Write an enzyme that holds these catalytic residues in place. Structure first.
Site, PDB file in Angstrom:
ATOM      1  N   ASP B  54      -7.603  36.501  49.706  1.00 27.91           N
ATOM      2  CA  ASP B  54      -7.135  37.885  49.201  1.00 27.91           C
ATOM      3  C   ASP B  54      -7.918  38.478  48.169  1.00 27.91           C
ATOM      4  OD1 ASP B  54      -5.593  40.135  49.028  1.00 27.91           O
ATOM      5  OD2 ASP B  54      -3.655  39.183  48.336  1.00 27.91           O
ATOM      6  N   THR B  87      -5.423  46.221  49.917  1.00 25.58           N
ATOM      7  CA  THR B  87      -6.137  45.963  48.622  1.00 25.58           C
ATOM      8  C   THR B  87      -7.516  45.596  48.822  1.00 25.58           C
ATOM      9  OG1 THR B  87      -4.961  43.939  48.082  1.00 25.58           O
ATOM     10  CG2 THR B  87      -3.797  45.893  47.475  1.00 25.58           C
ATOM     11  N   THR B  88      -7.751  44.723  49.696  1.00 26.14           N
ATOM     12  CA  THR B  88      -8.956  44.043  49.904  1.00 26.14           C
ATOM     13  C   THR B  88      -9.985  45.305  50.748  1.00 26.14           C
ATOM     14  OG1 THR B  88      -8.073  42.003  50.023  1.00 26.14           O
ATOM     15  CG2 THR B  88     -10.388  42.479  51.168  1.00 26.14           C
ATOM     16  N   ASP B 393       3.546  39.921  52.319  1.00 23.39           N
ATOM     17  CA  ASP B 393       2.558  41.018  53.038  1.00 23.39           C
ATOM     18  C   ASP B 393       3.394  41.503  54.399  1.00 23.39           C
ATOM     19  OD1 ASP B 393       0.763  40.601  50.969  1.00 23.39           O
ATOM     20  OD2 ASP B 393      -0.481  39.473  52.331  1.00 23.39           O
TER      21      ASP B 393
END
Lengths: 519, 528
Positions: B54, B87-88, B393
């Protein structure tokens, strides 16, 4: 074997004067991209490890902490620019260093610095005479109260991400400056708190003060969130029995006295709890945490309490309801209490926020902004401050000159014509003074991305043709009248800048030696 | 002051090192962006080794003095709070905008002209993607839960969850339905308690309509189940911070008995203080007792004969979840007890799981509550912790789907369509943005090329393949084979991403790229 110093470095000569100029150019070079509303931002890392991003030259330069003694003079004029005016601290440092930068070939030709300093003082005296001619006195002329605030705010908010939604922000911008005394308008009296989440057009203006809603504890959410005329109490000390972290030890020699001390601590707090009860205060504000016993007791008696209130925000609470802070819960006098017209805690920003609203005694306000990111809102916050400073100096000062390089090109123009009338060494110095005045319109076009060669040359044409009001349009690249586009600055800006920049110029150029004592 | 230990970057060297340093930090999470992305060994400051792919955890684990990379960490910080999924990819998308901006700087384009170019390119790409979205919750509602269940299977296929994921996807769907109403459409992740324990198998993970802790009753002979007791009101639970017993000092005891006088008194008092504190339960009318402090042997025996189960040493946060679900309160002493402060619930029992010695307890409701506790099991520690974040998630995925019914397919299908629309409109503007729009289209192509590099495919060959299949036929979404399915066209493979999630990803990434371009000067001082 003897020495003349003991480790005290002192250097002099004409090379030291040039070296003092290069130190000011390095400070100037950093502040060049920050000139203008579209200018670049400087990334500063303080020794405290706190990182800030702002384009305001005042806040920037105060964080540089320049050690160089001659370059420290640029810090003194920045505080003077922040005091007499408060806006334009970037241009006062660039203009001051440019006069020293353009004086570099004069020192190489062998021209004494006294004639260089005196040549600028004569050019400033001719510039002050022109500022009085360029100062326009306008209040009710071809304008009104609301129309003047709306037309000027749309241009200040232009060329921003808020450009399309600016119609909503101008309405709150006019309401913000009219919510305060028109004789004295302080930008610090208008509060702005960043709210993460929500659309940018949904921002609201509050007549009172707001808080951050620090409550993480269960048991809340049961209470009416709308109060009509509550009595607000400001408490300086904590009220708690068993806190959420620490504890207290009970040591006695008897078994029955164990529960007695536990009940004793309860009675000591419950006393101070029912003292606010007998005071009849519906709102309890405290800079210190409020325990579970107090929150549970106040909820059953229908009393609202807020713990760990910020000290800086509670000072605005005193300025809002006209109350006063009291240390204890016993001796509280009626003037410490306060009552507003409305108290509402809304869901604004997908987060509950408690605030005071409609305070008739309020000398300050709060403007809540919304948006997708806190950094974008901060850019809107400094954008609103730029519009407030324009209104702030539009009221206190009714003498207005055309900004955006308009007045700057007009001052430089006549000084080029005054060179023909002034024979001698003052002709080349004043002509270089007006040439050094060209950095202000230049850097504005270089920051936003405009072409410095074409726009400035086209600006030097129609401006010299008998129209004195042509500035540089920051929206669509072209030459244009800023008095029509309503880019305005008071006459005090041009007066204080030319006085402070020349003072910093003549003070540094008069330094022949840098004496640094070690120890 | 403190001129030493101060570095400054301005002019030519500023625009270069800022982009190169951003590419170096982003290059770590580029290979980790995807379902097949490679993991990362992350060593905590205590020396503990963790392995996760992550990017949000990577940037949080990375402690660095680079201010340009700190802006990338602030991007994943706001992206995790608003969405918590891309976010990645939001940092990799921003790095693609920075790399294309550096190529435009070398061509002589001003930084604001690049910033204004990415702004107009973003608003154009939003409108084109907004026209291609489809609605799920429309028509049949069971069809929504069908697509909602299969959408959770997509986000859970990149984790060890993928084995039993059929049951775990149902847990994410049943969790969002319980804490949300069809009219309100508000999903609060605080209302779903994420909890897990080691032991057993992962497929035994369930969902409880109430708080579930792992606790053993203070006495072994106490009954494992608590009945409503023949027509009483619910099941009354007591949360008190004081034990039921004669009070005792918590630091030192040392009570000196001078004579048999005090000995005979304390012998009779404390013996009678036993029953006086047990009768306080009947005075409040409570069944299950939960205290912060333990009990004596006699207290466990007296509560045994009265059928009053007791639990000792429960955390403060755990007491808050019980008070919210059962509408109870935390009572400081035994003199404040009442029937309105007791937790009201339908049934309380200690449930046994196989041969496991945990023997947890469950407080039920038998009607829809305002809060639930996600229950996770696993055969290994790291498997449990990975399943907790994998469902977390999924809770972020199901939140954006119910919040915005408009959905768009993903996995590289959306970014290419966004790139094809900007590349066509770049010729009509005829401005400086023409180079910024072509660079923006090439920056959007970085995401499917990055996914192709992690899946073992030619990033250049796949990019031309993703475009060619979306031209000759139709602009309809065509994805990538990264998950190893039969073919392309995720529409048949049911890979769905939220439109509100993809819009915030392309926005904050564009805004951060502009803020970096707005900084032409960096002044860094020492550490005091």
């Amino acid at each position: 074997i003897v020495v003349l110093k003991e480790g005290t470095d002192a250097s002099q000569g004409k090379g030291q004067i040039i070296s003092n100029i290069n130190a000011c150019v390095a400070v100037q070079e950093a502040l060049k991209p920050t000139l203008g509303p579209l200018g670049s931002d400087i990334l500063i890392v303080t020794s405290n490890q706190k990182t800030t991003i702002s384009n305001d030259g005042a806040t920037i330069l105060k964080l540089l902490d320049v050690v160089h003694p001659a370059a420290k003079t640029l810090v003194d004029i920045s505080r003077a620019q922040d005091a007499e005016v408060g806006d334009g601290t970037t241009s006062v440092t660039i203009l001051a260093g440019e006069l020293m930068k353009e004086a570099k070939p004069f020192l190489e030709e062998g021209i004494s610095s006294h004639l260089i300093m005196k040549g600028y003082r004569k050019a400033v005296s001719l510039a002050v005479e022109k500022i009085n001619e360029l100062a326009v006195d306008i209040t009710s002329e071809k304008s009104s109260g609301r129309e003047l605030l709306e037309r000027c705010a749309r241009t200040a908010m232009s060329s921003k991400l808020i450009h399309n939604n600016a119609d909503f922000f101008v309405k709150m911008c006019v309401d913000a400056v009219l919510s305060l005394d028109r004789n004295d308008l302080d930008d610090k009296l208008i509060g702005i708190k960043k709210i993460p989440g929500g659309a940018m057009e949904e921002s609201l203006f509050i007549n009172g003060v707001a808080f951050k809603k620090t409550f993480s504890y269960a048991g809340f959410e049961q209470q009416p969130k709308k109060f009509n005329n509550p009595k607000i109490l400001s408490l300086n000390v904590e009220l708690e029995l068993k806190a959420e972290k620490d504890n207290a030890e009970v040591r006695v020699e008897h078994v029955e006295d164990y529960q007695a001390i536990v009940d004793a601590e309860w009675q000591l707090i419950f006393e101070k709890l029912r003292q606010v009860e007998e005071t009849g205060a519906n709102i309890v504000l405290s800079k210190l945490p409020i325990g579970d016993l107090a929150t549970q007791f106040f909820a059953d008696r229908n009393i609202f309490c807020a713990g760990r209130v910020s000290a800086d925000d509670m000072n605005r609470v005193i300025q809002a309801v006209g109350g006063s802070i009291q240390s204890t819960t016993s001796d509280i006098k009626p003037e410490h209490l306060g009552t507003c017209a409305l108290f509402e805690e809304m869901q604004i920003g997908s987060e509950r926020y408690n605030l005071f609203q409609g305070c008739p005694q309020a000398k300050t306000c709060t403007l809540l902004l919304r948006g997708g990111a806190e950094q974008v809102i901060a850019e809107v916050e400094r954008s609103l401050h730029d519009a407030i400073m324009i209104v702030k100096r539009a009221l206190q000062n009714k003498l207005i000159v055309a900004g955006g390089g308009a007045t700057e090109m007009e001052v430089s123009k006549c000084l080029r014509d005054y060179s023909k009338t002034i024979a001698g060494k003052q002709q080349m110095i004043i002509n270089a003074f007006a040439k050094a005045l060209e950095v202000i319109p230049r850097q504005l076009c270089e920051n936003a991305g405009f072409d410095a060669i074409e726009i400035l040359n086209k600006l030097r044409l129609a401006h010299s043709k008998g129209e004195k009001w042509y500035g540089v349009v920051f929206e669509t690249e072209n030459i244009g009248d800023n008095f029509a586009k309503f880019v305005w600055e008071p006459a005090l800006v041009k007066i204080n800048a030319l006085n402070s920049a020349t003072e910093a110029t003549n003070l540094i150029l008069s330094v022949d030696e840098t004496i640094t004592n070690k120890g | 002051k403190d001129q030493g230990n101060k570095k400054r970057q301005h002019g030519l060297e500023a625009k270069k090192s800022h982009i190169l340093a951003a590419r170096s930090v982003a290059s770590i999470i580029k290979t980790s962006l995807g379902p097949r992305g490679l993991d990362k060994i992350l060593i905590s400051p205590d020396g503990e080794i963790t392995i996760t792919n992550d990017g949000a955890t990577i940037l949080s684990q990375m402690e660095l003095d680079n201010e340009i990379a700190k802006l990338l960490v602030q991007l994943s910080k706001s992206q995790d709070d608003e969405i918590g999924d891309g976010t990645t990819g939001v940092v990799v998308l921003a790095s693609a905008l920075l790399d294309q901006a550096l190529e435009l700087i070398q061509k002589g384009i001003h930084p604001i002209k690049i910033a204004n170019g990415f702004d107009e390119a973003a608003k154009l790409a939003i409108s084109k993607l907004e026209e291609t979205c489809d609605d799920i919750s429309a028509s049949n509602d069971e069809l929504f839960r069908d697509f909602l269940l299969r959408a959770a299977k997509t986000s859970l296929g990149s984790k060890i969850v993928s084995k039993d994921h059929d049951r775990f996807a149902e847990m994410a769907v049943e969790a969002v339905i319980n804490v949300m109403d069809k009219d309100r459409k508000d999903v609060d992740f605080d209302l779903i308690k994420m909890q897990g324990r080691v032991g057993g198998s992962i497929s035994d993970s369930k969902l409880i309509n109430g708080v579930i802790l792992d606790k053993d009753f203070s006495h072994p002979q106490m009954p494992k189940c608590v009945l409503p007791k023949e027509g009483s009101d619910g099941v009354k639970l007591a949360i008190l911070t004081c034990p039921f017993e004669p009070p005792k000092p918590k630091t030192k005891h040392k009570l000196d008995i001078s004579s048999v006088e005090e000995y005979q008194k304390l012998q009779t008092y404390e013996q009678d203080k036993f029953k006086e504190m047990i009768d306080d339960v009947k005075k409040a009318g409570a069944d299950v007792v939960i205290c912060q402090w333990g009990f004596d042997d006699e207290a466990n025996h007296l509560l045994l004969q009265n059928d009053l189960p007791a639990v000792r040493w429960v955390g403060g946060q755990e007491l808050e979840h019980i008070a919210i679900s059962t509408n109870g309160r935390i009572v400081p002493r035994f003199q404040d007890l009442s029937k309105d402060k007791l937790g009201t619930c339908s049934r309380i029992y200690e449930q046994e799981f196989g041969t496991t010695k945990d023997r947890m307890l469950i407080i039920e409701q038998s009607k829809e509550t305002k809060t639930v506790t996600c229950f996770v099991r696993g055969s290994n520690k790291m498997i449990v912790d990975e399943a907790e974040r994998a469902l977390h998630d999924s809770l972020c995925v199901v939140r954006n789907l119910v919040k915005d019914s408009r959905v768009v397919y993903g996995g590289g299908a959306a970014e290419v369509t966004m790139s094809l629309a900007v590349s066509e409109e770049a010729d009509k503007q005829r401005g400086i943005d023409q180079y910024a729009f072509r660079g923006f289209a090439q920056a959007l192509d970085t995401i499917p090329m990055t996914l192709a590099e992690n899946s073992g495919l030619d990033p250049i060959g796949t990019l031309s393949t993703l475009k060619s299949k979306q031209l000759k036929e139709k602009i309809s979404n065509i994805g990538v084979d990264c998950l190893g399915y039969g073919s392309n066209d995720m529409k048949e493979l049911f890979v769905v991403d939220p439109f509100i999630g993809k819009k915030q990803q392309i926005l904050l990434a564009t805004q951060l790229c502009r803020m970096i371009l707005k900084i032409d000067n960096v002044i860094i001082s020492g550490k005091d």
